């Protein structure tokens, strides 16, 4: 993922990008969505706006990190792509990592609205006019937000250990799955059990 040279944003907040293969983690969530160019910077702790306040809120003590690469060749078609919506009205802000898909018509005023648009009563959602002929910052941006965690349960998912070639009949410093020391490695005429 890191040395892909095909991404735009790979900022990692809680942990170092190069220490990912070292730390061992319990469970890994992975969120995904598509947003505008000028709103990728809003996917960060302590940010505000119409897409971070009540569309996708990241906790301040965030530990995973955010990946976002421009794709103006799959989600943008002539005449626009009206399959990508976003909420811009809500009663109140979002606590971190919350999902809201209800489509109750938002009421800005004190007037009862009764499920139909009217004066000071807006529809909650809004679409993206994803035109292929748009400047950068209005083009779609696919986003993935990895989010690591440390649970009291034992760690299950983490990176590959880099093995090396074995050497026989010399004095070296061995290490196999945790056991470590020094000595001479040689074949032995013994029998073990598969466990």
């Amino acid at each position: 993922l890191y040395n892909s040279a095909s991404f735009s944003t790979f900022k990692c907040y809680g942990v170092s990008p190069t220490k990912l293969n070292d730390l061992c983690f319990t469970n890994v969530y992975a969120d995904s969505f598509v947003i505008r160019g000028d709103e990728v910077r809003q996917i960060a702790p302590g940010q505000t706006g119409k897409i971070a306040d009540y569309n996708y809120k990241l906790p301040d003590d965030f530990t995973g990190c955010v990946i976002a690469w421009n794709s103006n060749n799959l989600d943008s078609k002539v005449g626009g792509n009206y399959n990508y919506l976003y909420r811009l009205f809500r009663k109140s802000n979002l606590k971190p990592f919350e999902r809201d898909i209800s489509t109750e018509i938002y009421q800005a005023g004190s007037t009862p609205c009764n499920g139909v648009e009217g004066f000071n009563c807006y529809f909650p959602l809004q679409s993206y006019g994803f035109q292929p002929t748009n400047g950068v910052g209005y083009q779609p941006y696919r986003v993935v937000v990895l989010s690591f965690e440390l649970l009291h349960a034992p760690a299950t998912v983490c990176g590959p250990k880099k093995s090396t070639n074995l050497v026989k009949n010399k004095c070296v410093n061995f290490n196999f799955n945790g056991l470590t020391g020094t000595g001479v490695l040689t074949e032995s005429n013994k029998k073990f059990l598969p466990f």
Partner: antibody
Amino acid sequence: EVQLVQSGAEVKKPGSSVKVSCKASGGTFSNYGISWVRQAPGQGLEWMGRILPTFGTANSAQKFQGRVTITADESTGTAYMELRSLRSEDTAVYYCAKEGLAFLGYGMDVWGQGTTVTVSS
Amino acid sequence: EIVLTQSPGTLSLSPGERATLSCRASQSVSSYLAWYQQKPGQAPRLLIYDASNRATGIPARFIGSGSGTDFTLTISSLEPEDFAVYFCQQRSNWPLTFGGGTKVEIKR
């Protein structure tokens, strides 16, 4: 390049009913949002009401309440603008136009072609 | 119910000059205003949305500005296909009322 094919001219009589259809050329509907605009002969435009096809929501302007009824048929991708109790001054050219699934913002980017409706006796 | 008002009524000019159309509102609309162009016997088409954004395919000679309760659409290089009636619609809240019109004529 979404196209909005519309109906043809319909001469009618006062007190009758009319049903103007705005079919989306290209198949079915999407998150469009469709609003109905009429223009009196040799005058300015007027906005009557809008419909949300896929989300099922529609009502007309405060002046036109109780008279206009906008419905959608997602199976074929066709919107209806049934207008009852036609009055002598309700003769105009009726348009349909997609305006983005919203209430404020973008605007009417693709228009139909006009359905001249003459209401006389 | 916000009421718009365009001025002047006809605004006659000559080819190659500059136009100036005003759409002062009745209440405050933040930045939501669309400008439509209607040639005779045709369907209106969108030119400027959000009071400063040019729609796709529109020539660059159309520029919009203003905010609050006084907007302005300005045409730099008038051409024969720029003489029509120009409408402004306030897309703020219910209902989305239109404006009067400005039949940009030709001088001789």
